[PDB]
Amino acid sequence: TLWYQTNYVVPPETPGEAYIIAMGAAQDNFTLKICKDTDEVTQQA
Amino acid sequence: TLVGQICRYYTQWSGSLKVTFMFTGSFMATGKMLVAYSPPGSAQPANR
Amino acid sequence: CVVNRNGVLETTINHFFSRSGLVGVVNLTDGTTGYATWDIDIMGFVQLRRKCEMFTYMRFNAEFTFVTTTENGGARPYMLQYMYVPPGAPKPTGRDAFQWQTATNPSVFVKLTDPPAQVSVPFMSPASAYQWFYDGYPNTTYGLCPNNMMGTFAVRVVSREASQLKLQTRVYMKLKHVRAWVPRPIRSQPYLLKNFPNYDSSKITNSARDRSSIKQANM
Amino acid sequence: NIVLAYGEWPEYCPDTDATAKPTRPDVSVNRFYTLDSKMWQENSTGWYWKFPDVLNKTGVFGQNAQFHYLYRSGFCLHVQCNASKFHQGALLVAVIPEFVIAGRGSPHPGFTTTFPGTTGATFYDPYVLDSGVPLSQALIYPHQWINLRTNNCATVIVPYINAVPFDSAINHSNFGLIVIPVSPLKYSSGATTAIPITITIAPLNSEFGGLRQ
Amino acid sequence: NIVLAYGEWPEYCPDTDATAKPTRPDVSVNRFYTLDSKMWQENSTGWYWKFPDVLNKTGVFGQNAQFHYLYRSGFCLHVQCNASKFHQGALLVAVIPEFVIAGRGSPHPGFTTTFPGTTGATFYDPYVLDSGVPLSQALIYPHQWINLRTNNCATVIVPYINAVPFDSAINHSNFGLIVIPVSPLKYSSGATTAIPITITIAPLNSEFGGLRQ
Amino acid sequence: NIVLAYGEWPEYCPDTDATAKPTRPDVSVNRFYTLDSKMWQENSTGWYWKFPDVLNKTGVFGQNAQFHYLYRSGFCLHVQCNASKFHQGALLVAVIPEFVIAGRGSPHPGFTTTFPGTTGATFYDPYVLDSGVPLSQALIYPHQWINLRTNNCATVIVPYINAVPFDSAINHSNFGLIVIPVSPLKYSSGATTAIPITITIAPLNSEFGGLRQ
């Protein structure tokens, strides 16, 4: 989750909106297993 | 994301993930946030 | 539920291409041409196309298998011919022309009742590796690389009599000693042309389905 | 600070064949070229270039890429932007090898669509990079964030990534440079509307071989 | 005296994976819990329990099996009964792993049929153990006779018998404890009718990992 | 930077009497609790809390102060506030032992007047601290200025100040934390009206002894 602890404080003459992007990856102990063909692509030829 | 794509192959998987946030505001502003994780047994929290 | 780890023998790049799959279907129908040509291209189905465009420079041998049936199922004994054309030689035109008796074209004579044939092809490009993207010009001359020509097969039944068979032949493909060089992200949009990445920008598919709002984690 | 692509430090020829011969130009060609500076607004959408196509018909290096048909070099991109502390928004610098503009509408693209010249071209579909590739996965490449509250430079060193160890410098194109505004730009009223973006390019170890005319 | 199941002396984790971490509780949880005591009569038929299901919602250990979803422990069952020298009959103490109540009448069993709670459930078919298994062959398991002319205690130590080295403590169930009166009880008239049976349970080397709420 | 009250570095029991025994909790209770954040305006007047009363019914520490009737700990208050460089005004952080709300109007105070709970109470007479004590003399105590042009943190370490070396954690109250805006807050128009104030509390060397229920 992502809660608010204090409302966003601007100085005067500053737009009071912003954006927060989110990034993700995997650590080093990440393992896999039995192969399987995919599902997202649908058609053929 | 990419790690959400190759896991559509490879029927089972395990490991640890990190999540990185970053911010796109002006230099003057300042506000605190709370980034909380919940354990996978139960539902999401309700209050602060 | 799962507490232990697993191995790294299966996530490697040699195993990621190692198992074999279908790539092509041809039809003979001798009654009436009497043969069937087929180009060598791994960009036949979208399932193998979406995997192999995760990279940009690959280097790999290959080995094929020809598995044939009849139309009904009864496999009477005959004798076929699977030829091969290295890139630069002219393809066959009729079933009895003089491109079936040369010495540069390796032939494979196999019956029908025997177990299926098998043959491997070495790496055949003047470059150090193949390319799957080529920016420039060697309108229609855009993006056509002269360094992916690999050859044909030109299946032909062997007779003097013009037998009345109607056959279907499948081609399976396996890769060996694969070394891939640089990565790139996976294509999301569907395909329209066989050799161009065009994507019909009048409508764009998204990468995630929608939901109710941003405050409800339950989808 | 700097981001070195793939860990190379680009070098000269590895004692190649069919050179007896290839010249090594002096510091008359190792100078910081500065291309033109665009303008980035509230509703702007992106830019890209091509290499070594934006350096042609320009300077001393223009007088060697059109009279030689063997070529090899490595570049040092130095993207810099200038803005005060009352603006916001974030750019994205990415150096992608083998950059192909696809084309739209169910129709091959034109000449100036794929070879822009010095003034770089713009996008139409920044969400799918005009190749059917989502921007969410687009950070496998050498990337470096320009974020207008922390830093104002982004230095990328690019080696020679190519299959054949000598290619031409007119028809082929090694890579491209995309700059995509991920965040929209907002600012309080009264201040400057446009914020510039400038580039700086310097060749590292350029070789040449084989002469024309 | 004591009977040690399968020769183990249960231990901690064997340096398991996906723990950086797992806590080891103090002697606040290593105390002798005492469940309720049933009554055994002339026409009684049997009892059984489940582990670790009869220890839930109870004590400090109840406040860890419902806020952790990784679990591992071993138990020390101490069955004791008290009767004077003018009564007769023999019990049977058996600790069976993977105890499944089947169900009867040619029809799945209910919730409280298979998870009894603290007050243990009774049988209906003591001859076939409610799983189609005859009691004549039922001494492969760790067993220990309580015989009312010789001894009055039966101590069983049970290690952690499980396939996955960490399972949950709510849905899964490791084993069960059956107590079957093989002999009927008879006694001369005038004396006490009911004879009690009490239990004692103490965890050995309980671990916990992963927290909820 | 930090301000250490009276020069103590709080420690454990000095080999006390009537302990054979008292437990020392692990790092499950040594985590940074964060209370709620108030809002400070142009006409606001003050806040205060009580310890260890604002930590009850909260977390793991709530599940030990209501099942033990002997208690001893020391706290680490970490007051922090966030405001841009166009605001002004100065706070005051003071940690006063034995803080008594008196009551007004020539009439004892109520329950929630003297035990506030997590949301702290406000003043009515900030000039005389609701005890008849002037604020001009009120800096004998451990104090630390938060001044919005220089610094934004104020760290106070408090030892266990008490007469009897073990007291209860429900009825008695060790000390309190007052935050008084000495300067009024003014700011030019158009900017943010409210400026938050947040707290952070972490126990140091908490002991417990004697169990209930």
Tab-separated table of C-alpha atoms in Angstrom, chain F residues 48-180:
chain	number	residue	atom	x	y	z
F	48	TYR	CA	0.712	17.649	24.531
F	49	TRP	CA	0.761	13.914	25.191
F	50	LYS	CA	1.462	11.514	28.037
F	51	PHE	CA	3.841	8.608	28.434
F	52	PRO	CA	3.527	5.654	28.524
F	53	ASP	CA	-0.153	6.333	27.933
F	54	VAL	CA	-0.110	7.111	24.202
F	55	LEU	CA	1.578	3.788	23.461
F	56	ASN	CA	-1.168	1.680	25.034
F	57	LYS	CA	-3.647	-0.359	22.939
F	58	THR	CA	-1.057	-0.206	20.147
F	59	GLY	CA	1.229	-2.840	18.677
F	60	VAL	CA	3.231	-5.439	20.554
F	61	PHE	CA	3.944	-2.935	23.332
F	62	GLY	CA	0.215	-2.608	23.935
F	63	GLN	CA	0.154	-6.366	24.544
F	64	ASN	CA	2.631	-6.068	27.402
F	65	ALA	CA	1.619	-2.933	29.305
F	66	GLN	CA	-1.846	-4.394	29.939
F	67	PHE	CA	-0.674	-7.836	31.075
F	68	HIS	CA	2.167	-6.730	33.331
F	69	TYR	CA	2.014	-4.571	36.444
F	70	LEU	CA	5.722	-3.863	36.811
F	71	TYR	CA	7.310	-1.632	34.217
F	72	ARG	CA	10.511	0.250	33.406
F	73	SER	CA	11.690	1.786	30.140
F	74	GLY	CA	13.330	4.737	28.460
F	75	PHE	CA	12.276	6.506	25.301
F	76	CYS	CA	13.828	8.220	22.271
F	77	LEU	CA	11.619	11.045	21.018
F	78	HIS	CA	12.326	12.180	17.456
F	79	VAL	CA	10.218	15.196	16.487
F	80	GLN	CA	10.362	16.220	12.836
F	81	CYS	CA	8.456	18.784	10.775
F	82	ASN	CA	8.492	19.646	7.079
F	83	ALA	CA	8.040	23.090	5.565
F	84	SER	CA	9.377	25.008	2.590
F	85	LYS	CA	11.583	28.092	2.748
F	86	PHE	CA	8.729	30.602	2.399
F	87	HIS	CA	7.183	29.989	5.833
F	88	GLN	CA	8.238	31.191	9.258
F	89	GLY	CA	7.638	30.615	12.939
F	90	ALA	CA	9.328	28.633	15.686
F	91	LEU	CA	8.242	25.657	17.745
F	92	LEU	CA	9.419	24.515	21.163
F	93	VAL	CA	10.081	20.931	22.236
F	94	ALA	CA	10.149	20.234	25.958
F	95	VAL	CA	10.055	16.996	27.933
F	96	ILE	CA	8.722	17.703	31.429
F	97	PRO	CA	8.549	15.046	34.154
F	98	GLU	CA	5.466	14.908	36.396
F	99	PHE	CA	3.156	16.929	34.174
F	100	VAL	CA	-0.111	17.840	35.920
F	101	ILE	CA	-3.085	19.452	34.211
F	102	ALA	CA	-4.613	21.635	36.904
F	103	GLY	CA	-8.107	22.719	35.929
F	104	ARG	CA	-9.725	26.120	35.580
F	105	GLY	CA	-12.510	28.349	36.833
F	106	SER	CA	-12.189	29.106	40.582
F	107	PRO	CA	-13.936	21.741	39.653
F	108	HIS	CA	-11.626	18.809	38.976
F	109	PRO	CA	-10.732	17.931	35.366
F	110	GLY	CA	-12.296	15.008	33.560
F	111	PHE	CA	-10.923	11.685	32.391
F	112	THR	CA	-10.014	12.544	28.786
F	113	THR	CA	-8.677	15.904	29.952
F	114	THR	CA	-5.737	14.270	31.732
F	115	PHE	CA	-5.334	10.996	29.771
F	116	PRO	CA	-5.604	12.005	26.125
F	117	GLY	CA	-4.993	8.819	24.198
F	118	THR	CA	-3.150	8.699	20.896
F	119	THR	CA	-4.594	11.941	19.549
F	120	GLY	CA	-3.039	14.428	21.937
F	121	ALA	CA	-4.956	17.112	23.751
F	122	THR	CA	-4.719	20.866	23.249
F	123	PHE	CA	-4.137	23.684	25.709
F	124	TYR	CA	-6.348	26.551	26.703
F	125	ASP	CA	-3.787	28.693	28.535
F	126	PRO	CA	-0.440	28.359	26.731
F	127	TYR	CA	0.934	31.325	28.643
F	128	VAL	CA	0.780	29.550	32.010
F	129	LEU	CA	1.031	25.892	30.871
F	130	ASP	CA	-2.284	24.945	32.605
F	131	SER	CA	-0.454	24.647	35.926
F	132	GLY	CA	0.182	28.265	36.908
F	133	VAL	CA	3.796	28.176	35.720
F	134	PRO	CA	5.004	30.913	33.337
F	135	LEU	CA	6.491	29.917	30.000
F	136	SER	CA	9.286	32.471	30.446
F	137	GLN	CA	10.934	30.252	33.063
F	138	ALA	CA	10.094	27.036	31.256
F	139	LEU	CA	13.529	26.186	29.840
F	140	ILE	CA	15.113	24.594	32.893
F	141	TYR	CA	13.819	21.323	31.392
F	142	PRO	CA	15.472	19.445	28.508
F	143	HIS	CA	14.520	21.639	25.576
F	144	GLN	CA	15.426	21.872	21.911
F	145	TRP	CA	14.331	24.558	19.464
F	146	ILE	CA	12.803	23.760	16.102
F	147	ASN	CA	13.414	26.897	14.058
F	148	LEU	CA	12.092	26.803	10.513
F	149	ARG	CA	15.008	28.656	8.913
F	150	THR	CA	17.829	26.461	10.246
F	151	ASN	CA	16.904	22.897	11.207
F	152	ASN	CA	14.025	20.454	10.961
F	153	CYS	CA	14.704	17.741	13.557
F	154	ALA	CA	14.898	17.634	17.340
F	155	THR	CA	16.129	14.444	19.000
F	156	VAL	CA	15.630	13.925	22.737
F	157	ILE	CA	16.714	10.872	24.748
F	158	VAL	CA	14.848	10.420	28.033
F	159	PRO	CA	15.910	8.051	30.823
F	160	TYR	CA	13.621	6.491	33.415
F	161	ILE	CA	12.924	9.256	35.951
F	162	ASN	CA	10.920	7.797	38.815
F	163	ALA	CA	10.990	7.453	42.581
F	164	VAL	CA	10.104	3.765	42.977
F	165	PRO	CA	12.320	1.641	40.678
F	166	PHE	CA	9.284	-0.250	39.315
F	167	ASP	CA	5.886	1.350	38.768
F	168	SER	CA	2.808	0.406	36.790
F	169	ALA	CA	2.079	1.428	33.215
F	170	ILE	CA	-1.669	2.129	33.378
F	171	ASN	CA	-2.444	4.387	36.332
F	172	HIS	CA	0.840	6.228	36.856
F	173	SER	CA	2.369	8.400	34.138
F	174	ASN	CA	6.084	9.114	33.915
F	175	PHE	CA	6.239	12.321	31.883
F	176	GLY	CA	4.747	14.264	29.012
F	177	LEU	CA	5.777	15.986	25.804
F	178	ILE	CA	4.654	19.528	25.097
F	179	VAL	CA	5.019	21.300	21.755
F	180	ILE	CA	4.222	25.007	21.963
